[PDB]
Amino acid sequence: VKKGFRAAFRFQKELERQRLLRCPPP
Amino acid sequence: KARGNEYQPSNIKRKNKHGWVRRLSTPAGVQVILRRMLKGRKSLSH
Amino acid sequence: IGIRLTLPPPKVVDRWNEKRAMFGVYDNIGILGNFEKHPKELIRGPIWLRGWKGNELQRCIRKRKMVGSRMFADDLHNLNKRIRYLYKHFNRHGKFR
Amino acid sequence: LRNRVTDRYFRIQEVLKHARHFRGRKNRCYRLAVRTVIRAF
Amino acid sequence: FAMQHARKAGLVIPPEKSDRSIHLACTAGIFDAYVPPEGTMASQVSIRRIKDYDANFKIKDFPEKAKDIFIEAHLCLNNSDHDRLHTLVTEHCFPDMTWDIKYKTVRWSFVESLEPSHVVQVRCSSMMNQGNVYGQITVRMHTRQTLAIYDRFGRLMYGQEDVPKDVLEYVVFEKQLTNPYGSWRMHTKIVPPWAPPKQPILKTVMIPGPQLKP
Amino acid sequence: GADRMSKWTSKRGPRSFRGRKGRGAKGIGFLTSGWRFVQIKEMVPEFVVPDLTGFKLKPYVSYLAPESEETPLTAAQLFSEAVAPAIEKDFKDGTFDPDNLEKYGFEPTQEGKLFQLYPRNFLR
Amino acid sequence: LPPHYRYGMSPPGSVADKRKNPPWIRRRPVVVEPISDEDWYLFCGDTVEILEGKDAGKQGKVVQVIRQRNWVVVGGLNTHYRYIGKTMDYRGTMIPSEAPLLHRQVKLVDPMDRKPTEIEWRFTEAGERVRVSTRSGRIIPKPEFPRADGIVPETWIDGPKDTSVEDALERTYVPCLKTLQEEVMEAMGIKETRKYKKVYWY
Amino acid sequence: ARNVVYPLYRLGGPQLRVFRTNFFIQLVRPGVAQPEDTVQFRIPMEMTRVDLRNYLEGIYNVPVAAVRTRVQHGSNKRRDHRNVRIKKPDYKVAYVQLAHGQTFTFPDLFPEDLYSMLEEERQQRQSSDPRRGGVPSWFGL
Amino acid sequence: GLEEFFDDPKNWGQEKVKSGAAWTCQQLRNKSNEDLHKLWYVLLKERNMLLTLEQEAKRQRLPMPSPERLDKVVDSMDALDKVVQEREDALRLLQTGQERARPGAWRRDIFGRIIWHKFKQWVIPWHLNKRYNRKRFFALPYVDHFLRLEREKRARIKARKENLERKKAKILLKKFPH
RNA sequence: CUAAACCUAGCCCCAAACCCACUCCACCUUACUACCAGACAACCUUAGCCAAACCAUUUACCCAAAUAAAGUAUAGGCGAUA
RNA sequence: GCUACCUAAGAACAGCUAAAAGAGCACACCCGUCUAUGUAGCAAAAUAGUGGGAAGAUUUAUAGGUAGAGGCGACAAACCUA
RNA sequence: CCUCCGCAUAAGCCUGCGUCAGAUAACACAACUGACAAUUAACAGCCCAAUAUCUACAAUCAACCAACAAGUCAUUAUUACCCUCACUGUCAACCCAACACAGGCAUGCUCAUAAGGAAAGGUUAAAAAAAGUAAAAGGAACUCGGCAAAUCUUACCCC
Ligand SMILES: [Mg+2]
Ligand SMILES: [Mg+2]
Ligand SMILES: [Mg+2]
Ligand SMILES: [Mg+2]
Ligand SMILES: [Mg+2]
Ligand SMILES: [Mg+2]
Ligand SMILES: [Mg+2]
Ligand SMILES: [Mg+2]
Ligand SMILES: [Mg+2]
Ligand SMILES: [Mg+2]
Ligand SMILES: [Mg+2]
Ligand SMILES: [Mg+2]
Ligand SMILES: [Mg+2]
Ligand SMILES: [Mg+2]
Ligand SMILES: [Mg+2]
Ligand SMILES: [Mg+2]
Ligand SMILES: [Mg+2]
Ligand SMILES: [Mg+2]
Ligand SMILES: [Mg+2]
Ligand SMILES: [Mg+2]
């Protein structure tokens, strides 16, 4: 694994964004 | 006429040309062995 | 892909330990310690650099002259090729001539 | 390796984000879009 | 075919011998089944034998907790809480209860109890069960409940939630006496033949006959 | 071409190597007079086999036997218990000296004995 | 065995263990707390208590113990469920399967008090090894255990291939100082007049 | 004995004698059918016939008529996951021709609870009737 | 004659055969000299019997009844060998004063590596023959340079492992408070 | 779906410390092969690429305290360079 | 260990003419004249046919020797592991 | 229906289509994986105690004749000389050519085989294309050239 966690943080924000668009709550 | 068939295997010739006793007898051949355990090969000779 | 899907574990940063609390101490031993010692002999490191700066060439020539007799044959051989390639490089290659 | 870009994923995605409507392999791959994205701009 | 294939395949092994032994919490099967009618000394010994292992033990109050464990264990099947059900139900009773309900939910409500649950007999194990003993109790139960099982897609397999119907069962409980943490848990059912069959299923089915080769 | 990892063996060579190599078998005789081999009983081993009658020992040991702490013998242990009593018997009763040490038993010179000790001739 | 070998539930050599750990697999190691036998105070069969994790606040007897990964096996405590029957057509009968527990997770118990108590590692002046408890001192004896070598030392019968205790312990040795090969010779009564001649060694 | 040096015998010398031999012999069942007298033995590669003859004659006290020697090559074709050659140990074989009329023949060796609760658990199991329709057979209703 | 190569027929077809404990080296010292000489041939006949079952078990593609019955005679026989050689080597040190019962000497081969070259078994002296003179028990001046090379590698291997266990000691010292 | 992801194995530089050899058998004949009459033995400048815009004199590569004197005395198709 | 040449001891060469042959025809065998095919091909030089030699300066197995500032060479500036 | 192939020795590889189970051009022949079995010496390798000494006269059916390239074989006197036949190779559809390669490969017998093999996966029967068969009349007018094919044919030049 390459060092760093800032990129992985903003990626989780992109993951949950896609999960929101895929299966949004009511 | 057709190449690839150069290697005509002969065990008595192999152990005479590239033999343990030959490389140890000649001073030049000694360099082949102790340069090899330096690398760490299992079969130091053939 | 280069990124990682899952996050890494949160690395705990101990800002108060033996090293960081006692960091920077005994650097001014000469200024207010009646100059009994210099701060250059304090640092722990190789013998070819204890309070001294040098480029790639300077550190190499200081190494072989000081500890080169103790260095390995392979490491010493790579050292001679290094300075020889870097001697000609700084002298012949580059701008400003 | 000591210093490596971690957000290469994002700086190309913003390029492809504008180039989603392109046809063929342009919207999918990167370098095909780089030639067309600046030309389209 | 397991031993024969091991011979032909060549996966020879020695007998697995180790100081460790697999400790169980329930005996498989039963010791004596109460043959019901068409509608003793050994019981009192088995009752007071349970008292020798746990002096604070009653019989008159057992049918109460039996029905209490009954309705709450089935309410756990509705909620699908496997953790509570495991401590309340034996390991022999779990697969026969919880296997077929996979890929489907279940609904089970308790209306009332027409007759009171009554102990039928009490049986007990011998000492030659892994140096342990296990007792068993049988209790008849005549109540009225509703049942409505819905499949993966939420359509009723059979039964209706609104109508209850009378039912008779002879529940079997058992408990581990060697340890003290053992508790009474549902084990098996006698399912006698003379009793009538339950309601059929609204759906129709077939069977494939003997596939006759050429 | 040929392999180096495989152990050298008689099988790989020609007729000469197939005959001269040998698979570790020890010598039994010599070969002269038109390849006429000649063994000798003096070189052939002779297994020394005792009688088993009146033999009550058995190969396996019962667990009822108690444990015994390890006491590996040595030169000091053997001499102080076996030959030492002979010393005090002669020291306290008669006279002796370094000469006539064969009375107690000693190895002055090995040549002249059948079973050599260093270099040992026997085996095991 | 290979380096960085993982000791699971089943022992080495078992079919389940070589399946889970073939020769080619190279998984991460485990950084277990180094505990030497000087400080180790947990043997099999002892009564031990648990107070956290799954099924916390109860007590059970140790079934076995493995010294490599510092795991304890308690019977009927911290038990999940698994099937063992054939999965082809039968569903598989359920059974309770035990789980490991770390040495720090588990705490020994006094037999008289039957409560979780700390442990101290002291010597009795009469010897040789003893385990003692915390603030209110009680000498904890060792539990006892059928070793794998002999299942019953007391209920043992001397078979035909087993020698009697008398024949085993009785001694007939004589410090004769004489060579082994020579001692056998006079026992046979055989003769040999030829002497071994000198030979060179280099 | 294997991996042990023997004494040199020159003319007029002592006789070689073994007291604690190290070789171990394998009486085995053969693959091909040999006659009734012939028996097979698998042994290390250092032994020969003359010492194996005195071996069987002395220790086991059986008369031996003759014996042949044979060597077999362990197949080195097997390869581990690292593609390294895996060789089986070679072994010497000896077909002993026994004495006048012993007529030896290899005898047969093997001619003839948790599983208790598991087996009975599978017979008390009831095959799901197709008329049931995959419904759980537990409930009364 | 040959039935002793197999156990009793009562044990044939049995899944677990009875077997006692193995021999202890201490009590083997306690026995006389002719006793263990007889016991060696007893364990020999026994060991051949157990190993006959091993090959026949692998041939029939089945396991043996008692696997640890095999090594019970193996660890008894070497222990018997341990007790024997413990008697003669103590005798050799008492009488002569040597440890190995095979003459040798530290010698430098052509590769410069010092090894305990054990003396071989010969009949004629070393100065008359021609084979032993070809072994060339000495190294040449150019070999000492190569001796330095593997000496460095031996230091590299030590420095790698010693630095490894140091880095190991650091990581759990970080994890565990101790 | 094919795939993707991980965090370890261990490695690199340092400092300190000088370092290695079954003692069951075999292993210089054809190494890993139990056993026979040979007179068979090492001591030698490194060179060249390259730089000098060619190339031919020449072009540091350590051998014994860090620094400083000092890039000084000096050498050199008195040129590069040393 | 291919090939160029050499060294020790060997092997092969049917049959028909001439009945002497570095003779003529022609198998095994050796070489590769000419044509086609193939060209990632069966093949890092082959297949089919037609051809030169085939008792000799012939062909060939086995073992040894000649090693690059060189060797070998019935000089093609050939051959010396594609 | 083919067989210019086959059998075996030497050389070479080393268990490489024997038994059992398994999965994986067709693989259920397995030549793939795991286990079991195996090739038994007379055949052939593995040799000779020393000193001194002898040894002009080919082979070719070896006789006549006939030569030249001048040739492949022998013992003797003395001393010493008790015992004995062990050890090793023995398989295969196999070797060198990156392959199950139309190639390379010595020796004895068979000269069409008592041995060993299968050119076609099935269909339709287009061109172009490769290897052959037959051809009216002409017979090199094609072509740099009778290249190729067919047939069985002469004479003259350069080197
Ligand atoms: Mg090649
Ligand atoms: Mg050749
Ligand atoms: Mg190779
Ligand atoms: Mg043989
Ligand atoms: Mg001819
Ligand atoms: Mg001619
Ligand atoms: Mg001709
Ligand atoms: Mg030529
Ligand atoms: Mg020319
Ligand atoms: Mg030219
Ligand atoms: Mg013969
Ligand atoms: Mg054969
Ligand atoms: Mg050829
Ligand atoms: Mg045929
Ligand atoms: Mg076709
Ligand atoms: Mg025409
Ligand atoms: Mg014309
Ligand atoms: Mg024209
Ligand atoms: Mg024309
Ligand atoms: Mg033509």
CSV table of C-alpha atoms (C1' of nucleotides) in Angstrom, one decimal, chain K residues 9-12 27-30 34-38 42-44 46-47 49-50 57 60-62 82, chain L residues 4 10-11 69 72 97-99 101-108 129-132 145 147-149 152:
chain,number,residue,atom,x,y,z
K,9,A,C1',42.2,-48.1,-32.5
K,10,G,C1',37.6,-49.7,-35.5
K,11,A,C1',33.0,-50.1,-38.9
K,12,A,C1',30.4,-49.9,-43.5
K,27,C,C1',21.4,-49.5,-53.9
K,28,A,C1',22.5,-48.5,-48.7
K,29,C,C1',25.1,-44.2,-47.7
K,30,C,C1',27.3,-38.9,-48.5
K,34,C,C1',18.3,-27.3,-61.0
K,35,U,C1',12.7,-26.5,-60.6
K,36,A,C1',8.4,-25.8,-57.6
K,37,U,C1',6.2,-25.4,-52.7
K,38,G,C1',6.7,-23.3,-48.0
K,42,C,C1',7.0,-29.4,-40.4
K,43,A,C1',11.7,-26.8,-40.1
K,44,A,C1',16.0,-20.0,-36.6
K,46,A,C1',12.6,-28.2,-44.6
K,47,U,C1',9.3,-31.3,-48.1
K,49,G,C1',11.0,-34.6,-58.0
K,50,U,C1',15.3,-34.3,-61.0
K,57,A,C1',42.0,-37.3,-51.6
K,60,U,C1',31.0,-42.4,-40.3
K,61,A,C1',30.5,-43.8,-34.6
K,62,U,C1',33.8,-43.5,-30.3
K,82,A,C1',21.8,-21.1,-34.7
L,4,C,C1',12.5,-46.4,-47.4
L,10,A,C1',25.6,-49.0,-28.7
L,11,A,C1',24.7,-43.8,-27.3
L,69,A,C1',49.9,-47.3,-49.7
L,72,U,C1',45.3,-55.3,-36.6
L,97,A,C1',16.1,-30.2,-32.4
L,98,A,C1',12.1,-24.3,-27.2
L,99,C,C1',6.9,-28.9,-29.0
L,101,C,C1',8.5,-30.9,-34.5
L,102,A,C1',7.5,-33.9,-42.2
L,103,G,C1',14.2,-32.6,-39.4
L,104,G,C1',19.2,-34.9,-37.1
L,105,C,C1',21.0,-40.0,-35.6
L,106,A,C1',26.3,-45.2,-35.6
L,107,U,C1',26.0,-50.8,-35.6
L,108,G,C1',23.8,-56.7,-36.6
L,129,A,C1',-4.1,-21.6,-55.3
L,130,A,C1',-0.6,-26.4,-54.6
L,131,A,C1',0.6,-31.5,-56.3
L,132,G,C1',-0.7,-35.0,-60.5
L,145,G,C1',17.5,-19.1,-72.2
L,147,C,C1',13.3,-23.2,-67.1
L,148,A,C1',9.7,-27.1,-66.2
L,149,A,C1',7.5,-31.5,-68.3
L,152,C,C1',16.0,-41.3,-74.9
